[PDB]
């Protein structure tokens, strides 16, 4: 808690790492959340939802 | 006074100076004097 907190506002090197980590985790969480809502809104329309998927003849 | 060593000065400076608000009082020809924001940025070093 206080250990990381005092390092972030005191050293710019730590703060820069905090920005990089936030960009990494923040973008991944948004990408995951957007995909979950995309899957929910498109039930049954996916490529793997095809009933005859695997029997061409 | 003898108890104030180099580490003591740095600790006190971090308590009172580092990234701290300042008060400015200027008079005369002071158009070239930097603004509050410039003085406020110069209270910390981003290279550390």
């Amino acid at each position: 808690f206080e250990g990381f907190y005092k390092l972030i506002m005191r050293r710019n090197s730590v703060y820069v790492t905090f920005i990089i980590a936030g960009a990494f985790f923040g973008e991944r969480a948004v990408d995951y959340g957007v995909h979950k809502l995309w899957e929910r809104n498109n039930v049954g329309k996916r490529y793997e939802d095809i009933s005859v998927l695997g029997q061409r003849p | 006074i003898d108890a104030v060593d180099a580490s003591t000065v740095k600790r006190v400076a971090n308590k009172y100076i580092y990234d701290k608000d300042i008060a400015i009082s200027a008079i005369g020809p002071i158009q070239d004097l930097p603004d509050y924001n410039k003085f406020r940025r110069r209270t910390y070093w981003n290279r550390y």
Partner: peptide, 28 residues
């Protein structure tokens, strides 16, 4: 102030490399 800063900036550089290049799977 010199060794600690060098360690801190090296850590940020390593974090940036893992963030730009994602070597997930290369960690074997």
């Amino acid at each position: 102030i010199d060794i600690q800063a060098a360690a801190g900036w090296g850590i940020a550089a390593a974090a940036g490399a893992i963030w730009v290049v994602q070597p997930f799977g290369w960690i074997k």
